[PDB]
Every structure is written in structure tokens, then in C-alpha cells.
Coordinates of N, CA, C and O in Angstrom, one line a residue:
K380 N 12.9 10.6 -18.5 CA 12.1 11.0 -17.4 C 12.4 10.1 -16.2 O 12.1 8.9 -16.2
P381 N 13.0 10.6 -15.1 CA 13.2 9.8 -13.9 C 12.0 9.6 -13.0 O 12.0 8.8 -12.1
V382 N 10.9 10.3 -13.4 CA 9.7 10.3 -12.7 C 9.8 10.9 -11.3 O 9.9 10.2 -10.3
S383 N 9.9 12.2 -11.4 CA 10.1 13.0 -10.2 C 10.1 14.5 -10.6 O 10.9 14.9 -11.4
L384 N 9.1 15.1 -10.2 CA 9.0 16.5 -10.4 C 8.8 17.1 -9.0 O 7.6 17.4 -8.6
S385 N 9.8 17.1 -8.2 CA 9.8 17.4 -6.8 C 8.8 16.5 -6.1 O 7.7 16.9 -5.8
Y386 N 9.2 15.2 -6.0 CA 8.3 14.2 -5.5 C 7.9 14.5 -4.1 O 8.7 14.4 -3.1
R387 N 6.7 14.9 -3.9 CA 6.1 15.2 -2.6 C 5.4 14.0 -2.0 O 5.2 13.9 -0.8
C388 N 5.2 13.0 -2.9 CA 4.4 11.9 -2.5 C 5.2 10.6 -2.6 O 5.9 10.4 -3.6
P389 N 5.1 9.7 -1.7 CA 5.8 8.4 -1.6 C 5.3 7.4 -2.8 O 6.2 7.0 -3.6
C390 N 4.1 7.1 -2.9 CA 3.6 6.1 -3.8 C 3.0 6.7 -5.1 O 1.9 7.2 -5.1
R391 N 3.7 6.7 -6.2 CA 3.3 7.1 -7.5 C 2.8 5.8 -8.2 O 2.2 5.9 -9.4
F392 N 2.9 4.7 -7.6 CA 2.5 3.4 -8.1 C 1.9 2.6 -7.0 O 2.2 2.8 -5.9
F393 N 1.0 1.7 -7.4 CA 0.4 0.8 -6.4 C 0.3 -0.6 -7.1 O 0.1 -0.7 -8.3
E394 N 0.4 -1.5 -6.2 CA 0.3 -2.9 -6.6 C -1.2 -3.3 -6.5 O -1.8 -3.2 -5.4
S395 N -1.7 -3.8 -7.6 CA -3.0 -4.3 -7.6 C -2.8 -5.8 -7.7 O -1.7 -6.3 -8.3
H396 N -3.8 -6.6 -7.3 CA -3.6 -8.1 -7.2 C -2.4 -8.4 -6.3 O -1.3 -8.6 -6.8
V397 N -2.7 -8.4 -5.0 CA -1.7 -8.7 -4.0 C -2.3 -9.7 -3.1 O -3.5 -9.9 -3.1
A398 N -1.5 -10.5 -2.3 CA -2.0 -11.5 -1.5 C -1.9 -11.1 0.0 O -0.8 -10.6 0.4
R399 N -2.9 -11.4 0.8 CA -2.8 -11.2 2.2 C -1.7 -12.1 2.8 O -1.0 -11.7 3.8
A400 N -1.5 -13.2 2.2 CA -0.5 -14.1 2.6 C 1.0 -13.8 2.1 O 1.9 -14.4 2.6
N401 N 1.1 -13.0 1.0 CA 2.5 -12.7 0.5 C 3.1 -11.5 1.2 O 4.3 -11.3 1.2
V402 N 2.2 -10.7 1.8 CA 2.6 -9.5 2.5 C 3.0 -9.9 4.0 O 2.2 -10.5 4.7
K403 N 4.1 -9.5 4.4 CA 4.5 -9.7 5.8 C 4.0 -8.6 6.7 O 3.6 -8.8 7.8
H404 N 4.0 -7.4 6.2 CA 3.8 -6.2 7.0 C 3.2 -5.1 6.2 O 3.7 -4.7 5.2
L405 N 2.1 -4.6 6.7 CA 1.3 -3.5 6.2 C 1.6 -2.3 7.0 O 1.6 -2.3 8.2
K406 N 1.8 -1.2 6.3 CA 2.0 0.1 7.0 C 1.4 1.2 6.1 O 2.0 1.5 5.0
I407 N 0.3 1.7 6.4 CA -0.4 2.6 5.5 C 0.0 4.0 5.8 O 0.2 4.5 6.9
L408 N 0.3 4.7 4.7 CA 0.8 6.1 4.7 C -0.3 7.0 4.0 O -0.6 6.9 2.8
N409 N -0.8 8.0 4.7 CA -1.8 8.9 4.1 C -1.1 10.2 3.8 O -0.3 10.8 4.6
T410 N -1.3 10.7 2.6 CA -0.8 11.9 2.1 C -1.9 12.9 1.6 O -2.8 12.4 0.9
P411 N -2.0 14.1 2.1 CA -3.0 15.1 1.8 C -3.8 15.0 0.5 O -5.0 14.8 0.5
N412 N -3.2 15.0 -0.6 CA -3.9 15.0 -1.9 C -3.4 13.8 -2.8 O -4.0 13.6 -3.8
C413 N -2.4 13.1 -2.3 CA -2.0 11.9 -3.0 C -2.7 10.7 -2.4 O -2.5 9.6 -2.7
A414 N -3.6 11.0 -1.4 CA -4.5 10.1 -0.8 C -3.9 9.1 0.0 O -2.7 9.2 0.4
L415 N -4.6 8.0 0.4 CA -4.3 7.0 1.2 C -3.4 6.0 0.4 O -3.8 5.5 -0.6
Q416 N -2.2 5.8 0.8 CA -1.2 5.0 0.2 C -0.8 3.9 1.1 O -0.4 4.2 2.3
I417 N -0.8 2.7 0.7 CA -0.5 1.6 1.6 C 0.9 1.2 1.3 O 1.3 1.1 0.1
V418 N 1.7 1.0 2.3 CA 3.1 0.5 2.1 C 3.1 -0.9 2.7 O 2.7 -1.1 3.8
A419 N 3.6 -1.9 1.9 CA 3.7 -3.2 2.4 C 4.9 -3.9 1.9 O 5.3 -3.7 0.8
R420 N 5.5 -4.7 2.7 CA 6.6 -5.5 2.3 C 6.2 -6.9 2.2 O 5.4 -7.4 3.0
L421 N 6.7 -7.6 1.2 CA 6.4 -9.0 0.9 C 7.3 -9.8 1.8 O 8.4 -9.4 2.2
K422 N 6.8 -11.0 2.0 CA 7.6 -12.0 2.8 C 8.8 -12.5 2.1 O 9.9 -12.1 2.4
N423 N 8.6 -13.3 1.1 CA 9.6 -14.0 0.4 C 10.3 -13.1 -0.7 O 11.5 -13.2 -0.8
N424 N 9.5 -12.3 -1.3 CA 10.0 -11.4 -2.4 C 10.7 -10.2 -1.7 O 11.5 -9.6 -2.3
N425 N 10.2 -9.9 -0.5 CA 10.8 -8.8 0.4 C 10.8 -7.4 -0.3 O 11.5 -6.5 0.1
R426 N 9.9 -7.3 -1.3 CA 9.8 -6.0 -2.0 C 8.8 -5.2 -1.3 O 7.8 -5.6 -0.7
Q427 N 9.1 -3.9 -1.3 CA 8.3 -2.9 -0.8 C 7.3 -2.5 -1.8 O 7.8 -2.0 -2.9
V428 N 6.1 -2.7 -1.6 CA 5.1 -2.4 -2.6 C 4.1 -1.4 -2.0 O 4.0 -1.2 -0.8
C429 N 3.4 -0.7 -2.9 CA 2.4 0.2 -2.4 C 1.1 -0.5 -2.7 O 0.9 -0.9 -3.8
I430 N 0.3 -0.6 -1.7 CA -0.9 -1.2 -1.9 C -2.0 -0.3 -2.1 O -2.1 0.8 -1.5
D431 N -2.9 -0.6 -3.0 CA -4.0 0.1 -3.3 C -5.1 -0.1 -2.3 O -5.5 -1.3 -2.1
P432 N -5.6 0.9 -1.7 CA -6.7 0.8 -0.6 C -8.0 0.4 -1.1 O -9.0 0.5 -0.4
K433 N -8.2 -0.1 -2.4 CA -9.5 -0.5 -2.9 C -9.5 -2.0 -3.1 O -10.5 -2.6 -3.6
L434 N -8.4 -2.6 -2.8 CA -8.3 -4.1 -2.9 C -9.2 -4.7 -1.9 O -9.3 -4.3 -0.8
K435 N -9.8 -5.8 -2.3 CA -10.9 -6.5 -1.5 C -10.3 -7.0 -0.2 O -10.9 -6.7 0.9
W436 N -9.2 -7.7 -0.2 CA -8.6 -8.2 1.1 C -8.2 -7.0 1.9 O -8.1 -7.1 3.2
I437 N -7.8 -5.9 1.3 CA -7.5 -4.7 2.0 C -8.7 -4.1 2.6 O -8.6 -3.6 3.7
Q438 N -9.8 -4.2 2.0 CA -11.1 -3.8 2.5 C -11.3 -4.4 3.8 O -11.6 -3.8 4.8
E439 N -11.2 -5.8 3.8 CA -11.3 -6.6 5.0 C -10.4 -6.1 6.1 O -10.7 -6.0 7.3
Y440 N -9.1 -5.8 5.7 CA -8.1 -5.3 6.6 C -8.6 -4.0 7.3 O -8.5 -4.0 8.6
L441 N -9.0 -3.0 6.6 CA -9.4 -1.8 7.2 C -10.7 -1.9 7.9 O -10.9 -1.3 8.9
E442 N -11.6 -2.8 7.4 CA -12.9 -3.1 8.1 C -12.6 -3.5 9.5 O -13.1 -3.0 10.5
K443 N -11.7 -4.5 9.6 CA -11.2 -5.0 10.9 C -10.6 -3.9 11.8 O -11.2 -3.6 12.8
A444 N -9.4 -3.5 11.4 CA -8.7 -2.5 12.2 C -9.4 -1.2 12.5 O -9.2 -0.6 13.6
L445 N -10.3 -0.7 11.7 CA -11.0 0.5 11.9 C -12.3 0.2 12.8 O -12.7 1.1 13.5
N446 N -12.9 -1.0 12.6 CA -14.1 -1.3 13.5 C -13.6 -1.8 14.9 O -14.4 -1.7 15.8
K447 N -12.4 -2.2 15.0 CA -11.7 -2.6 16.2 C -11.9 -1.5 17.3 O -11.2 -0.5 17.3

């Protein structure tokens, strides 16, 4: 299984337990029924990860940017 049945959605996986300090850049991607998917790249590890929008530091992130 390659994990793709006509993949309509970017993030089929999310990273839980992530650091505000290990991520260089957050870019959130919303998809109709695949919900809110966060895309973030790490600084040193440089990996592109999908961040789960229920993470606590992420809460702080959207609280800020959305209350802004």
C-alpha cells in the first residue's frame, strides 16, 4: 500500500509533540473535509511536517494571529 487512493488531501499524517522553537516556518493549509492542516518546516532538521491544529503552542499561535 503506497497510501494513496487518489490523494486529494496533503496531510494524511500530522506531527504531534512539536516545538515552537524547532519550526522555522508555519504555513497552514485548509482542505474542505480533510480539515485544517498545518504545514511547517523545521529549522535544523529541515523536514516538512504537518502540524496538528490542536497542539497547545499552536493554540497560542492561532490565538495570536487570529485575534490580531
